[PDB]
Design a protein around this nucleic acid. Structure first.
Ligand SMILES: [Zn+2]
Ligand SMILES: [Zn+2]
Ligand SMILES: [Zn+2]
Ligand SMILES: [Zn+2]
Ligand SMILES: [Zn+2]
Length: 147
DNA sequence: TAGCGCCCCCTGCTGGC
DNA sequence: GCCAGCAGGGGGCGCTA
């Protein structure tokens, strides 16, 4: 924000409250992660990130879809899932204007369709070049009996 | 501080084409 | 094989009480 009073003494960012600067410095500069999982080595800057992480250990899925049986561990994942029902495609490739349901899909599109000289994968068993690593995985399972 | 969201990242698979 | 759809784990910030 323009007049944000709390300037970071280590980068160009500034914040409206000192609490926001404190948290930003923990994330980006000092890396103090006060909140520690008791079941693995995970630790986080914010407690809410620990709580979300714990749901991966327990399987808790608090956020139920009202149109199907899906339920998520994170409110945003449910909002992302609702795009499968609405057909919303919020992301647009600035180069060719194709639209996508997720931002990562769009980034991958730009890598595969609008980027010069991208390194490709190669099947060693049949001498086929494959663009995406996951499609090399599929090829190995489908054509070379990877179990 | 904890707590609510908003949103992006990276990963890696699926099935239509 | 190419492609966009689509979910899991996670980082970082906006904002408030
Ligand atoms: Zn900073
Ligand atoms: Zn853990
Ligand atoms: Zn649903
Ligand atoms: Zn494009
Ligand atoms: Zn092969």
């Amino acid at each position: 924000p323009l007049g944000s009073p709390h300037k970071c003494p280590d980068c160009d960012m500034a914040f409206v409250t000192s609490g926001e600067l404190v948290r930003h410095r923990r994330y980006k500069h000092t890396h103090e992660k006060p909140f520690k999982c008791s079941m693995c080595d995970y630790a986080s800057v914010e407690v809410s990130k620990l709580k979300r992480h714990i749901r991966s250990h327990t399987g808790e899925r608090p956020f139920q879809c009202s149109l199907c049986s899906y339920a998520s561990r994170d409110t945003y994942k449910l909002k992302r899932h609702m795009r499968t029902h609405s057909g919303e495609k919020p992301y647009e490739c600035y180069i060719c204007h194709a639209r996508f349901t997720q931002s990562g899909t769009m980034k991958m599109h730009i890598l595969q369709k609008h980027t010069e000289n991208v390194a490709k994968f190669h099947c060693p068993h049949c001498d086929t070049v494959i663009a995406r690593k996951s499609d090399l995985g599929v090829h190995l399972r489908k054509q070379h009996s990877y179990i």
